[PDB]
């Protein structure tokens, strides 16, 4: 049995800018059980159906997971733009796979704010699909070099979400899992 529980029920999730990727292989995957396994608020598959996923085999399955704002979940889809799609986690236009999300306010918000979850707010250019950027150099927003010194036009590139339990639903944390289905010239190991 594929260790989906390890991904979906992990105690901590990654920050979106440092999104985690888990490789799943050599196992049987029941995606109908996965679909019905909890109340997910988002469960959208692109080019595939979870019922038809049960009759397919893949070389590897990849599960990307992270936390974002509720208002940002729509950016975890092919063809989207915004601070998450552009600078944190980018799906390809031709994405095949599934996107699953659920409200995680009970786990990831703190009274006073959970500042452990971050996203990249400043970046010179957009991310390529499935690119990950974990640099934290002070970001030069003007003509004057920063030399590692924060100040006017010189910004730490990551921002904390600061999730609080009293946030409105759209600003509460949502845990997200993206499933990608890989086909290599190699024996199938996930069926």
């Amino acid at each position, epitope marked *: 049995l594929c260790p989906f529980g390890e991904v979906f029920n992990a105690t901590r999730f990654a920050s979106v800018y440092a999104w985690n990727r888990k490789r799943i292989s050599n196992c049987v995957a029941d995606y109908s059980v996965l679909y019905n396994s909890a109340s997910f608020s988002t469960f959208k598959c692109y080019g595939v159906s979870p019922t038809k996923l049960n009759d397919l085999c893949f070389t590897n399955v990849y599960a990307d997971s992270f936390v974002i704002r509720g208002d940002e979940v729509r950016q975890i889809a092919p063809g989207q733009t915004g601070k998450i799609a552009d600078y944190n986690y980018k799906l390809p236009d031709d994405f095949t796979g599934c996107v699953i999300a659920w409200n995680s306010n009970n786990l990831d918000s703190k009274v006073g704010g959970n500042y452990n979850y971050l996203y990249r707010l400043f970046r010179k*250019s957009n991310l390529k699909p499935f690119e990950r950027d974990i640099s934290t150099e002070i970001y030069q927003a003007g003509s004057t070099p920063c030399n590692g010194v924060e100040g006017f*036009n010189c910004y730490f590139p990551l921002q904390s979400y600061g999730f609080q339990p009293t946030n409105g639903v759209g600003y509460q944390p949502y845990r997200v899992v993206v499933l990608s289905f890989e086909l290599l010239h190699a024996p199938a190991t996930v069926c």
Partner: single-chain antibody
Amino acid sequence: EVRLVESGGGLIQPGGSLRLSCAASEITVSDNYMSWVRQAPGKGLEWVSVLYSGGSAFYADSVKGRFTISRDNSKNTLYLQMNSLRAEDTAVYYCARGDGWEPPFDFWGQGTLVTVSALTQPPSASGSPGQSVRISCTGTSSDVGGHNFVSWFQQHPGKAPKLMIYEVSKRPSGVPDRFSGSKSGNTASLTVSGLQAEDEADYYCSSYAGSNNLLFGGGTKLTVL
């Protein structure tokens, strides 16, 4: 010097077209959130468009499909192409750095006039010199009451708005600490204490409202009596 300098403008008939320019100094347009904000004569502020450092563009519902934001990195200049103009596009158009909530509109151009032929604030408020006044800004749980992306602006006649408070209670460098921002439930408040004649001005609140909607209050005129 840090500058944002608009050009272009004038009088157009409905269905006409105009392109505005915003030439920056020190601020690097291609590396920043850059926006246009407009103000119809005698009225409040309305966010128009933002251009992201990576090239993504977003637009207010009122202009989507008619306006286009763009830039020339070699000229360090931001542009607003405005097509299919209507009478209701009449406004002073400001460029500004920021997206209006994260990061806030901290730096503003001078404005340029184009003529084509919600958050609840009290219309007015007053206080006495050295005393205090509280300006309220009432939203809903999906904006003011749902997050901390609330800003406050001061605007004097003939000048661009000036960022006074961001993130509910944070003051930009140089803003006097007798300007204080807070929030209770769905209502944000700007408290101005130690009131001085120069505090006479219009004050606007702003809040992100989700789905790339940026809201401004209708403005409060502050009289110091």
